[PDB]
Amino acid sequence: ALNWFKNEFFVDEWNIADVVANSENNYFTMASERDVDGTFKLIELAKASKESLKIIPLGSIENLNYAQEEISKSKIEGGWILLQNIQMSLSWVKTYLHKHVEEHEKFKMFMTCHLTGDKLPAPLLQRTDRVVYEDIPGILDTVKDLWGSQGVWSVYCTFLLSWFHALITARTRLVPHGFSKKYYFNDCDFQFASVYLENVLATNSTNNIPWAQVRDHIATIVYGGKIDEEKDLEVVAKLCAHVFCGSDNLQIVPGVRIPQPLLQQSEEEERARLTAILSNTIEPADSLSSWLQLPRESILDYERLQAKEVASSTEQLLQE
Amino acid sequence: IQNFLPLETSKFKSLTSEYKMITTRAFQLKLTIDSLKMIKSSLSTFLERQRRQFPRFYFLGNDDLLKIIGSGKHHDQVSKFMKKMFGSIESIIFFEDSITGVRSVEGEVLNLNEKIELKDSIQAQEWLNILDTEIKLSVFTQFRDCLGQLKDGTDIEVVVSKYIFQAILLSAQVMWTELVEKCLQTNEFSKYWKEVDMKIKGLLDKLNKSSDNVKKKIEALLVEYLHFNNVIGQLKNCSTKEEARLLWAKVQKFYQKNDTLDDLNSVFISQSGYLLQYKFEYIGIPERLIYTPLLLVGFATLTDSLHQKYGGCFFGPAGTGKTETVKAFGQNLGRVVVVFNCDDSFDYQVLSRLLVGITQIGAWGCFDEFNRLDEKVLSAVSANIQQIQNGLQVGKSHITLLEEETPLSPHTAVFITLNPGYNGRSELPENLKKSFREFSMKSPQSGTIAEMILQIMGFEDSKSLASKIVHFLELLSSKCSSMNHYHFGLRTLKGVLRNCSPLVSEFGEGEKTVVESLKRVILPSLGDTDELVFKDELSKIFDSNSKAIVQCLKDAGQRSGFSMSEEFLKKCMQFYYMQKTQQALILVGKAGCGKTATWKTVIDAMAIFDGHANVVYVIDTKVLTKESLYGSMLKATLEWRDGLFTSILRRVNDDITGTFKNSRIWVVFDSDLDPEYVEAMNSVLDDNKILTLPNGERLPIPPNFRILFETDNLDHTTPATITRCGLLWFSTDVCSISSKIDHLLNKSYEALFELDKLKDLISDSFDMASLTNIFTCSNDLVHILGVRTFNKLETAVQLAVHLISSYRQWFQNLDDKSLKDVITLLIKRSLLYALAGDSTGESQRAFIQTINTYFGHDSQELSDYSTIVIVSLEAHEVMRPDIVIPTIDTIKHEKIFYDLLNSKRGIILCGPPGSGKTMIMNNALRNSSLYDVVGINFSKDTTTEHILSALHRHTNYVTGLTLLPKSDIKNLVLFCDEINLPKLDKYGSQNVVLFLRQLMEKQGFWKTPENKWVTIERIHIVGACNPPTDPGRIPMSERFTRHAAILYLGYPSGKSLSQIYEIYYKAIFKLVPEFRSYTEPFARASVHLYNECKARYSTGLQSHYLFSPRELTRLVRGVYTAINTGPRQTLRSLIRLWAYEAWRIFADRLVGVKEKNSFEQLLYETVDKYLPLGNISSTSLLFSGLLSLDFKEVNKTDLVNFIEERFKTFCDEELEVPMVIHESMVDHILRIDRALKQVQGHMMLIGASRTGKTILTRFVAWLNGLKIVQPKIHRHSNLSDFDMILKKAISDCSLKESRTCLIIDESNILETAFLERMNTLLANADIPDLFQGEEYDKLLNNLRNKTRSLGLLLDTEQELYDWFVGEIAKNLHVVFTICDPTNNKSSAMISSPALFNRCIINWMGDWDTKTMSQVANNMVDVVPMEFTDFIVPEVNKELVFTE
Amino acid sequence: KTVLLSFLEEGFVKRLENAVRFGSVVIIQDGEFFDPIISRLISREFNHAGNRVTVEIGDHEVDVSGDFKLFIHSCDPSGDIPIFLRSRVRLVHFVTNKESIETRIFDITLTEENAEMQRKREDLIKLNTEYRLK
């Protein structure tokens, strides 16, 4: 019901790449909460744009001098500059960054800050384009985003890993019910699990994949390393048991089913088949209970509080 | 190497020639050290370049590195640094002019394959590289021979004694891996399980029958063989081949390549499919961790992160196995893990230099407590960590950190261990957390650890004993009290198991040893009821000779004066048993409960028992800063400066004279435990036993080097430091009242034909039965600054012994009854002034009555004013600040103060402001020629440097190093006016109060640069304070206040204050004898006015409404001054003058118009009541000496015309500010003139902005001829510029006799150091910080020549400095301008004690309606404005502010 | 005659003293970082000696030409102004409101729809204003 407004009226959406490409501004800033980092998105964007990204964190005067020299070099010979953690050099941000922004074509400068951190200067903030980085709330959209960033068994394992990562990152948002604490799984977890999957597939060339080994390593090392609670470790283990069971047919969600690859296709055919399955999947309205295998009354409270907060803020905004 | 720098070589040759000439001149019958250091500091870049040849030189200091290059032929200087460079190697074995082998820190000898021939032309690093390679080749050769022999069916029990432990370990691991894989090729494990079990039993028998080195080897091998047995049993119990392969995938497999010709990379380790290379580095025989599931999963996480070339990360609570698990992973991977203890002193340069060192070496660097770094430093090194990561991933040959392209070894790995969730610990940023792969280590397997440890130690029922121990620990953690220092986790279990090792030889390997070790570890940390809980649960879980050390303890106690009670003996035995295996101890209890007595007695007893000398250092932790306790780096020179603890440990480790070989070293931290301070020593306290420094130095902790922590509470202390140290808990005091009195009496006797008779008579008069009743009755009184009756006994005994011994000349002319009477009377006086001496007068009288009624009526009666025996002032004398009206309370207070000062006891004078503490101190010490007074006035931000600067011109430093006064006859008295005001830190510690406690207790302190102990010889400390109930007052530490005698000063009563002030009024009225009979009504009127003002205007209205007898003194001085410089007075003029001075002294600080009208009606009531006159309003009392040659009441119109013409002249001469004249600015001008005509007359102007404060100060100062000095303080202006302008103003004011007015705005106080400087300037007459070093000598000679030019005969520095401070007090006036009184810095300015007590507050406020109407009507009357008809409106009277 | 100084730059004291001596109009940016060296300039407290007007900035006197005007600019709303400056300056707030918003959006709409019509309307308005002034 909350998303009905933006679905029915607005027929377009903008990501970080679209904001960077479709703006006449050389200065960008990125904000996010704690335990969420979005610099890998800028790394991917600089790779896709055939640019050079210079990443300079701001904690010490040596880093500040290096940032000044690299900014001076970038204004003349192009290149992309990322300033991580600008709120830990607030005096430098208030003086040098303010002066430089106040006074090359392929030059772009990015600043990474915190939404819940110290306040940035308003004249500096108003002169740069502003984005907020956060995970995609949808599950199917998360699988599509993970799938669009990529023999046949490697493709199948990457599809299963995208599904598992989307399910666990959607489950992390339901703090009391999906887990017990607040955990943050990210592209590092996805990359480490993908490297482990490729290593298992390379070291087992007889196509007898150790699915129990894959389940236990993903549940205990790659994703269970951050977990310090036994109940949440069991939650991750049960999710791995559902996803990486290694059966002939796998119904990852009650809607769609993922058949295992045959022995007479190619990697492009497997990619096209899995993309067709992903396109033919429809996300239901009760996805947080049907797809995460949770009772409906657990997610109903969370959805009702979210909608109540959103609609109350809308009512207060409209009353003025 | 000298030819590289020719000028430096020539300078070195000249210095060496000069040194040789000096040595020849000395042998025939300072500057050398300076010449050595001036080229040594130029050798820092040379040593830094030398560090890149052998990269392990980063683990050495500059001095150690200089020794390494300097040992060009001896080669034995290198052998004593192997533990620093390598970690596992202790010394190098030398024979036949060659490197025969190396010796590990456990004593194991690794013989090389071939000798390394040492030539004189080979550099130290040149042969160190050869040694480093040959060690790895030798380890590989030993492993290859052991594996080849084991593969031929040879049993391990005959090759344990042949090869090194690392060789046997790797060969056994490879054999076990291949044989288990062969067993997995089938489905049979029973035969191999039985074979491994019989191998374990045979190794246990050989452990029973071996020597020390073979015993260590077998003890370390049994860990891995029990791990092998556990894995084989787990695989045997698997039901499915897939399940068995799943279990075998997640363990560490050990293989050997058969085709690679490169020998050092022929062994790799496989776990969960990932391969890691063995390094073959020598590890010795380290302590091996018991293999647990948590250990194996952590190994798998580390393997995964190192396969991706990421960083390893472990997080969890303290004492779980993070650092040791990283070290054990490195040991299994064949290398020594370098362990760093991170700190807030580890900045970006330090962290990056450590990363450069480990990346050049190739070592695995573990950074423990990575979240103790600052957040900025954590963010800054993220790029460096990512650079190391990417270089390791892509195989880059070099990386660029710290502006230098250094080589990157492919063997490097970065590990961090952190403990989130505790206070004072930062959070890692996300871009840094994505560079590491974290793993939770919350719950270790303590049952498995204890079971295999007891099995290796040889206990008969290891599984049952481990189950009992772990159940007992969990049960204790469940049902003991929930206070913060109870921890019964893995570190407690390890300590329990380590005390089982030396107890078996007397108690047998079993439950008795386990119970006695549990009582040795856990019992001293428990309380009263927790001890009974421990005993009951120990008795219900488990089934069930120290005469020499008890006798040694008794000998130490009765040589030091203590008495051995049951509790004191129990605490002493507990401390002696805990120190045996635990190298770090914490003694916690109440203040003055017996911690110092306990540990001093135990170490004296152990010195007697063993013959080992004890070297004791007592360091007060929070008196020193952290960079002075551990050390700091000079960024201008990159040179390390040793801290105090670092210097002590370095001296112990170096041991130049050899005195520390057969001695025990005790370092006592006698302060409250700050986690910031003590968590920098976590690697010292734990099993690493190393002191990691920011410059890479590594100081080992010798076994005879023990650290003591003496503190009073553990509120802020973290479990990370609680668990690493054994804790001795003091539930109650270790001494009784009678025993404490006996010990104190014996101590006082030892400091002194009639001596034995005096001792017997005093000890008989100290009747404990009558004493304990008044001791338990004194607790019902109200005591300000509450010190316990147990701690007042030192004051009582010292005062009684001093008062008795001061009358030794007159003890041979009286009989025994009178002698007993006078001794008992002095005992009553001492008991009163020690027990109830810090209470009110009523409580003191009640305690006198209880003392008299409880000591019996037959003895001599102590009265209110009991003592033992063998005013008309002047008009010019009322202005003297050193004159005191003698009253009975003043005489009594001076007598008890002098007695307590002569008793060599610290004194604290508590009381309300203005009560007379400073007055009675100065009056008591003015008539004494044996004492000198230095006055230090503390603020909220006082440092020990301020105290040392105040002690600079009075004391001398003579060398050991003692601090004694310059005068050889008079002693020195430290007066500290506000000991309640210095602020706590964020953990609640007062640096100045701890420094004063250090001085009072230990009679000295430590010098922070040079780390030398200073001794206090003849300096007494006298404290003054306000009650802690007052705002801004902080309760002082009981550890400090228990060392001082507290005397409560009170306000004099109404009649007492009257009788004080009629004498002042009589001395005033000697100038006017025609009104001599009015002294009584004037003084009663003044005292009643003060009482009424104090009752009406209080703190509850506004914070600065504080009144005292200082206000009455100001009224007396102002009345005298105005009478003296005025004309002939009548009664009406005298009453109006008293009303005017009362206005300017009591009500210039009033803000409300209602309060000012109330003060006006109060003056009317007081005058009508006491002195039976026109209007006495503030605008109707215009007294000024501006319009004539004398101070008199002047006409308003003539005053206004005078101000008009003088201000026209002022604007035409100095600054054109075209203002307009009104009555409020006029009487503000008059009161500013009154304050600026005074001596020590300071103003604090408070009012709205653009009211006229600064311009009126300038106009009045121009009227009085003062020199206006406004400091040019702006942005980017600091304490250096503030001190420069203050010193310039003070110097001009004193030397040039320039009368100076100093206008200080609120905006000029950038930080609170400015306010502290102004507090020093106004409390004293100068700042001791400005004139020190060469500046003191420059000031002294300038004062000498100025005084000689002025024709005054002053020679001594005391006289010259007295003339200096008198000139500044005469010729300097300070005016403060405050615009917004509600700011935080303005509130700190107003509530400042020196500025409040010294200045005259003039609350100008904002303009009112009359002033605004006058200003507007007076500057709109000059325009043509009445050019039209105007109809007067009909409005209300209240709506019209004008006429 | 306009010079552009800033409180956050170096050489500020020398440039402002030279501008005061010349008599040039000064606009000082970053007004929330006020430097108290020019307190005499803010309070207009000068010393008159004959036909010369002198002001003391820092540690030495400079002359006031009489044609010198001082402007202080700040682009940071809700910043920090000291009370000495705040009581003595004419603080003027330049914030955009709905009338300016409507005018600028209508001007942009007219430019993007019929640029010739907008140019003709602007020229006619300017000509009418000039005709009224004439």
Ligand SMILES: Nc1ncnc2c1ncn2[C@@H]1O[C@H](COP(=O)(O)OP(=O)(O)OP(=O)(O)O)[C@@H](O)[C@H]1O
């Ligand atoms: N067994 C004893 N017999 C006699 N006197 C004792 C005994 N134990 C302690 N005392 C006395 O108790 C007094 C308390 O001082 P002590 O040094 O023991 O205190 P503390 O525990 O170190 O306190 P603080 O917190 O001030 O460091 C000392 O004067 C000491 O002589």
Ligand SMILES: Nc1ncnc2c1ncn2[C@@H]1O[C@H](COP(=O)(O)OP(=O)(O)O)[C@@H](O)[C@H]1O
């Ligand atoms: N698997 C194990 N086997 C035997 N002893 C262990 C094991 N794990 C930890 N320990 C012991 O427990 C203690 C843990 O302390 P440490 O790991 O240094 O604390 P931290 O984890 O805070 O760094 C060490 O003294 C170590 O000897």
Ligand SMILES: Nc1ncnc2c1ncn2[C@@H]1O[C@H](COP(=O)(O)OP(=O)(O)O)[C@@H](O)[C@H]1O
């Ligand atoms: N005999 C007396 N008893 C009490 N107060 C007196 C006596 N004689 C003078 N005074 C006045 O009492 C005031 C004491 O204030 P002070 O000693 O400065 O208080 P504090 O010691 O708390 O700073 C002095 O101003 C002094 O003039």
Ligand SMILES: Nc1ncnc2c1ncn2[C@@H]1O[C@H](COP(=O)(O)OP(=O)(O)O)[C@@H](O)[C@H]1O
């Ligand atoms: N009686 C008065 N008549 C006219 N102007 C006044 C009067 N009193 C104050 N002012 C104005 O207020 C300002 C006072 O400034 P000054 O006294 O230098 O410091 P402060 O701002 O602290 O009062 C002057 O610039 C003056 O213009």
Ligand SMILES: [Mg+2]
């Ligand atoms: Mg650790």
Ligand SMILES: [Mg+2]
């Ligand atoms: Mg005082």
